[PDB]
Write a protein that binds this ligand. Structure first.
Ligand SMILES: Nc1nc2c(ncn2[C@@H]2O[C@H](COP(=O)(O)OP(=O)(O)OP(=O)(O)O)[C@@H](O)[C@H]2O)c(=O)[nH]1
Ligand SMILES: Nc1nc2c(ncn2[C@@H]2O[C@H](COP(=O)(O)OP(=O)(O)OP(=O)(O)O)[C@@H](O)[C@H]2O)c(=O)[nH]1
Ligand SMILES: Nc1nc2c(ncn2[C@@H]2O[C@H](COP(=O)(O)OP(=O)(O)O)[C@@H](O)[C@H]2O)c(=O)[nH]1
Ligand SMILES: Nc1nc2c(ncn2[C@@H]2O[C@H](COP(=O)(O)OP(=O)(O)O)[C@@H](O)[C@H]2O)c(=O)[nH]1
Ligand SMILES: [Mg+2]
Ligand SMILES: [Mg+2]
Lengths: 434, 429, 429, 434
């Protein structure tokens, strides 16, 4: 009865949700037909019909019909309500102005009409799970259009975002520094907590930790699905120490500007390394604070953790949890901020993370999703401003954006706001006087 | 006669209390159904304090389960001893507290508090003579800290003469289970010094040490930590439920233990605590139960009593034991630890001796210590509060829910008032 | 001796009454055929009040079913307990009321009223000593409002000494089940204040809350709402049908409940009301049945009693119970709710205790409240009447059936007379 | 014994009745031969012979023999009494004067002779169901001739009309603004409640809600048949809360001029969307007050509902009915008129709407036919006057009407009456003073 609907914007948002909703059907025994052979645990993400057919609380939206028609013809064709699978005709096409003004304004009333039909049959609606990216025009433009609208119609709901942050050296599009600054100026006053995820840092984990020389986006979407299945584990399943979506934004957002933590999942092993280590709760907790296992390309040793959130699940004993965390406050490489002596939120669930068939993770008995809000993400925004300040000084690509319904001065409005955001990590990351 | 309404707030209090009602059902011979199945009539002599008898000779607990998320209520009603509670008592929200004091005390909890008080008042009318209310919760959560301390403020207004003993899990010194738990604990101790007659400070770090060092459980779950609190919770109210050679109630353990109406922050303790192997290598004697309580490694709060002085000490005993052997040992710890007790209270031990031991034990104890060792419990939190508040971090989640910075200034001034008071009477002569 | 002719007008009264005769046949052990099949002779001691014994020891109900469309009569005679009524009693038109008061009171109902009164008078001659007539109908319909209140005017002329208690479903506050129900209710309350000795105001919104909140029926049909009214309908006339330690009839519940001859608008209530799960978690006691009645969430009218004062209260009890336990609780609600009762009537509770509980229950109750809380029931309708009448909308369907605007002016003046009277005696001291 | 005969005028009226009387035989198990293998529920629309052959209480009349001879040779040849199937020789031919004066006056005594032979064997005749259109000459002219005659011979009977209102942008004939004004001046003082239905608004519903790119008139006549089968559901079947034909005109006509509500049916789904939603009574009630699901091309947000009529049927619980309707009076987009606080009539029937084989609706367990009388239909008559004021100012097409038995001044009589009707929605739609 703690329902929670999720929104999937852009190609990145839908392809993450293809692995998320595959994972949720395995966690609840749901067939791809929506049935289950032979427990009101589905209810947070699954609304049930009059028969035994459970349909998801998802809104898959993309301005191009390519990625949705693979969903409409895939294995989970019969699972999804066909009015939820919302398309356009032409994509936003790596253009924030097409995603927000030209193409996004067409079907923004169609998506909100489908959000409202889900929210009416949700008697206990907690919040939103917007899966998008910062690089694509749909994931940046249409999300920023949608987060304005949901903050008007709902406002008090806990709107969680799960962005794909663009990597420093890997960038599969040219104008990703434009789409990321323009989507962050908009969603800053509207989102409540946006969980950053990077592509290059999961390329490293799938190569090193999972031993795959050639990982796909299919492999990266399995790991991001295990993050969200660990965050929303306490709603779906009974745990020893539970946590709500309102509790993530409470324990991780000290200031309403700074709401950008970074997700870190552990253990990430293959079947050949399911043996050769026992994976206690202290073995996997030191995995999360290791800078190699984080999923955003930042050095957490170059910053200070403002707030961490260790989401244990599986065969996890709370005494050994205290044995694992108390060692980390003694270490110097994990350093906190001066105003925060209490920098942990712990959640224990009784369910182990399940294994998807064809998945590249091993069946473990316990896991942890560290959601650490840190000072070290300011180096990420300093890169992205420097990628923005090189391009905009020559006014490159601006005619693709002005010609779709945008003022040229609005780029200075987004850059001055980000420069105001960059000193916010500087103002908080320093220590107090007296 | 002297009924107690048990209130459970937060995920923590619902998980402690579900183990508490597992002990009370065992001590009174109550099945999962709710029907009496014991053999002695001493179990039914004071059955009324924690039970209302329904039709068909079924006893339902006088427990009120409060949460802001429905996840903990499903864990109770589908677990064992879940079909014994009344479904009217399960009062739960949908949104969750958000790990937030202000969303539990002002926004979502104030919407649900009238759904609880109408069940509190409905239970309190069926009581013949009301003893008082006990609340189990935490201080680092949002429902246990916001919604829980909202109920105490709305009951002490409606029941100012009753006793309000809280079993509040205090944030541990080493690990932080919540990023904003310095903010949530400080805004609750503001509400506990003004509205509770007594308050039992429990640390999760201390119960980790007791399950590891003393009980030799290398892997204790929460249900092993909850069994330690539940044996302590039933031990404070055991002379009220069973006959004894020197009885006490929740008022005798409040009159004798609270010399000043703010200084009512207690540290619990239990004895005996033996492993499965080391239980045949030890004799159950009153000198052994005495020396097990009064050390540092048996405190269920993670503060060393040697860094302070006991103002008042309650040692509630259970089992067929002799009073001279008790009175010798209570004197014995006052001679050898005469610096560890306060000077200007002579003979600062309250003794209660019940006649009924716990299930499977020959005799037992329960330590209730009112020391100045919990000034370190609040010197730590008010340091962690001031370090976070001086940069005003994590504040817009509480300011944005209808609060100002004055509430944080007054709650931190109220805590440093109480830190100075335990600093005063420790050095007062 | 003291027979009652039950009259059923409208679709509503035919559907309530078909559930009413399901209860009376169960309380008296009557089969679908009409023959007695109970075991106790207390069922046949006062069988005559709701039954005429025919040849072959078959009891037929003294019910007169009135409608203007033949659709409801087929639902009765083809449903269960449909072959028990006399086919002479089914007096129905063809056209339907048209959801119109004037087509039910002047055009089609006046053509059919002589077909009913010749059956009313035929039943009233076979009665030895006539107690009085009860009518079940609505106020928003056309047959229940027009044809029903036409029968009351044509019976009070022919039987001015008898009691005329109506069980009238009042239009709900939130939803409007009829576009012209402010017009139909106001033209019926004009006919109810002049021709009924007492009138039982029932809201559909209130029974939706009771079936959802109290009985935990997430999907209640009409037949679940009719079972709530039928247990209340049999509860008012249960000391007249069965022996009791303190009996009452429809005149004791009218003499004690009507201080002024216009103020006879009652709100009903029933207890106990438990779910299927929550029935083993509650004891059936007279203090539990008392505290269940006197709140707001058990009123079958959708008006809060806390916004008014009870003038007079009737609490008819059923089952083997003790009189001190009754008299303590009736005093108990007068102490703690002394502002909620009227001042200048001291001891304003009428108690009736029958000896026979309902089927499958140990004991029961029936609340009959005469409060000033139904001044909000008529401040709402007369506001909805005046808002529609000031633009004269939907008026030509009533003016076109032989009426003027003066009838609407006099009926709205008659209602605002009665609103001022409940405003008067609530503030009178 | 609550008999009700129905009249079908014009090509639109007969082709609606081909789907209506197909639907009624399925609801009662009647064969196309009039028999039924292996319950006096038929009686309101079916008179029975001495054998087990049930014949309908219908009068199919058209001034051309084209549409009737498809009925006389179709599958329901053996169902209909051949004297009821009344034809002419030449159609009225989109001419009101031919339908009312030239061709209509010939067989008006033949149709009334067949109405009277039905009304004599109806012992409980409640009223009439005139199925016609506003655009065609027969449906406008011959109906307006017939409604004068039935108001003389019967008068007090509840004469319900089910018009096909002409769409604003779709008009399949040129002189539809002439036939509609001239038929409304006549039937205003004679009809009691006329239920408006539009073609373009059901084109939208068959495309969007039913997912048919190419719907036919066969598809539109199935949806209008489900409206009438929901209106006359309480007579044919036992319901929890019943409603009569006299109760529709009572609860929806506040003033004798304004008797033009608009029908709205829900749910309108296909078999692929019979799943993926549970369709509670609150899910289908918010469907009706949505402006996309109405069957008249008007914006109900641009007007105020004077009176609504929610005709529930099927597995419908009356408690959840109150839960569905009480939310709507709280909403601002559904606003009522100041004089009407009580703006609902609810009817619950125990019968679900059945599915016709070959039909494009899914077998649901519950439905609702909202018959909402609103202020927003004045914009429809303002369009139709403006279509009338353009054509008549140049006196176009008037010689086709004067040359068949009509005064030219009679057009001013119909336009002044419609201008008197247009201010009636203005006089009622405003709020009261003091
Ligand atoms: N982690 C992950 N990232 C993806 C996936 N698919 C695309 N992306 C990332 O998404 C970024 C660009 O956003 P897209 O989703 O491709 O484009 P869009 O959001 O649909 O916006 P448009 O281009 O206007 O359609 C690229 O940098 C990709 O790295 C995926 O399956 N998993
Ligand atoms: N909904 C619906 N409308 C129809 C149907 N058939 C015709 N119409 C409408 O009827 C309108 C014109 O009226 P018709 O019935 O065709 O003509 P008529 O009433 O026979 O009058 P005449 O032309 O003189 O014969 C057109 O605008 C059509 O949209 C139908 O089967 N269903
Ligand atoms: N001793 C003990 N402590 C617990 C248990 N479950 C949770 N806690 C503590 O309770 C705190 C969480 O508060 P909680 O009530 O769950 O948060 P809320 O739902 O927002 O009110 C954490 O600091 C945990 O240490 C338990 O079973 N036993
Ligand atoms: N409680 C209850 N009310 C009903 C029932 N059936 C109809 N009603 C109410 O009766 C009113 C309709 O009046 P009705 O007698 O059916 O109209 P009439 O046929 O024109 O007189 C509506 O307001 C319904 O709320 C029922 O079974 N139970
Ligand atoms: Mg794309
Ligand atoms: Mg034609």
């Amino acid at each position: 009865m703690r329902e929670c609907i999720s929104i999937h914007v852009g190609q990145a948002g839908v392809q993450i949700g293809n692995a998320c909703w595959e994972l949720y059907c395995l966690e609840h025994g749901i067939q791809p037909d929506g049935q289950m052979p032979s427990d009101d645990s589905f209810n947070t993400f699954f609304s049930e019909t009059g028969a035994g057919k459970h349909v998801p609380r998802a809104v898959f939206v993309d301005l191009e019909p390519t990625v949705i028609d693979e969903v409409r013809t895939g294995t989970y064709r019969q699972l999804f309500h066909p009015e939820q699978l919302i398309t356009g005709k032409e994509d936003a096409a790596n253009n924030y102005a097409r995603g927000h003004y030209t193409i996004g304004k067409e079907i923004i009333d169609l998506v909100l009409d489908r959000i409202r039909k889900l929210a009416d049959q949700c008697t206990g609606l907690q919040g939103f799970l917007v899966f998008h990216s910062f690089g694509g025009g749909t994931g940046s433009g249409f999300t920023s259009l949608l987060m304005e609208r949901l903050s008007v119609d709902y406002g008090k709901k806990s709107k969680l975002e799960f962005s794909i942050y663009p990597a420093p050296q890997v960038s599969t599009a040219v104008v990703e520094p434009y789409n990321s600054i323009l989507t962050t100026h908009t969603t800053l006053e509207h989102s409540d907590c946006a969980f950053m995820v990077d592509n290059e840092a999961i390329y490293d984990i799938c190569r090193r930790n999972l031993d795959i020389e050639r990982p796909t986006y299919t492999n990266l979407n399995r790991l991001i699905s295990q993050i969200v299945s660990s965050i929303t584990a306490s709603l779906r399943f009974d745990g020893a120490l539970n946590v709500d979506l309102t509790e993530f934004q409470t324990n991780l957002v000290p200031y309403p500007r700074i709401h950008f933590p970074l997700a870190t999942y552990a253990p990430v092993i293959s079947a050949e390394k399911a043996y050769h280590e026992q994976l206690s709760v202290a073995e996997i907790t030191n995995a999360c604070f290791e800078p190699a296992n984080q999923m955003v390309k930042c050095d957490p040793r170059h910053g200070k953790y403002m707030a961490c959130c260790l989401l244990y699940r599986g065969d996890v004993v709370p005494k050994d949890v205290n044995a694992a965390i108390a060692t980390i406050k003694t270490k110097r490489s994990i350093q906190f901020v001066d105003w925060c002596p209490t920098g942990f939120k712990v959640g224990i669930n009784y369910q182990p993370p399940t294994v998807v068939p064809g998945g590249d993770l091993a069946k473990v008995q316990r896991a942890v999703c560290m959601l650490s809000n840190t000072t070290a993400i300011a180096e990420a925004w300093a890169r992205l401003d420097h990628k923005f300040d090189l391009m905009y000084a020559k006014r490159a690509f601006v005619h693709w954006y002005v010609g779709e319904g945008m003022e040229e001065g609005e780029f200075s409005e987004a850059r001055e706001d980000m420069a105001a955001l960059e000193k916010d990590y500087e103002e908080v990351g320093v220590d107090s006087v007296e | 006669m002297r009924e107690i309404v048990h209130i459970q707030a937060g995920q923590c209090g619902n998980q402690i209390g579900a183990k508490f009602w597992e002990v009370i059902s065992d001590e009174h011979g109550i099945d999962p159904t709710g029907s009496y199945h014991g053999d002695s009539d001493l179990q039914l002599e004071r059955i009324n304090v924690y039970y209302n008898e329904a039709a068909g000779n079924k006893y339902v607990p006088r427990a009120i389960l409060v949460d802001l998320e429905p996840g903990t209520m499903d864990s109770v009603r589908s677990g064992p001893f879940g079909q014994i509670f009344r479904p009217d008592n399960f009062v739960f929200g949908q949104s969750g507290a958000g790990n937030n004091w202000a969303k539990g005390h002002y926004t979502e909890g104030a919407e649900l508090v009238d759904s609880v008080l109408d069940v509190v008042r409905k239970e309190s009318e069926s009581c013949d003579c009301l003893q008082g209310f006990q609340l189990t919760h935490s201080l680092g959560g949002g429902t246990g800290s916001g919604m829980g301390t909202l109920l105490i403020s709305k009951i002490r207004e409606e029941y100012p003469d009753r006793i309000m003993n809280t079993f509040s899990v205090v944030p541990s010194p080493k690990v932080s289970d919540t990023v904003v738990e310095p903010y949530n604990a400080t805004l609750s101790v503001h509400q506990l010094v003004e509205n509770t007659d007594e308050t039992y400070c429990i640390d999760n770090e201390a119960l980790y040490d007791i399950c590891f060092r003393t009980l030799k459980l290398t892997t204790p779950t929460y249900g092993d930590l909850n069994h330690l609190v539940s044996a302590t919770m039933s031990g404070v109210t055991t002379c009220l439920r069973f006959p004894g050679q020197l009885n006490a109630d929740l008022r005798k353990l409040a009159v004798n233990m609270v010399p000043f109406p703010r200084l009512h922050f207690f540290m619990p303790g239990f004895a005996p605590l033996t492993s499965r192997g080391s239980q045949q290598y030890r004799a159950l004697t009153v000198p052994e139960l005495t020396q097990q309580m009064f050390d540092a490694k048996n405190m269920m709060a993670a503060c060393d009593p040697r860094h302070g002085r006991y103002l008042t000490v309650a040692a509630v005993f259970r089992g067929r034991m002799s009073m001279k052997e008790v009175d010798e040992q209570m004197l014995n710890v006052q001679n050898k630890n005469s610096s560890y007790f306060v000077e200007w209270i002579p003979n600062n031990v309250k003794t209660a001796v019940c006649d009924i031991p716990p299930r499977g034990l020959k005799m037992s104890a329960t330590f209730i210590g009112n020391s100045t060792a919990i000034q370190e419990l609040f010197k730590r939190i008010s340091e962690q509060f001031t370090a976070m508040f001086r940069r005003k971090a994590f504040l817009h989640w509480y300011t944005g829910e209808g609060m100002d910075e004055m509430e944080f200034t007054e709650a931190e001034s109220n805590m440093n008032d109480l830190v100075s008071e335990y600093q005063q009477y420790q050095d007062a002569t």
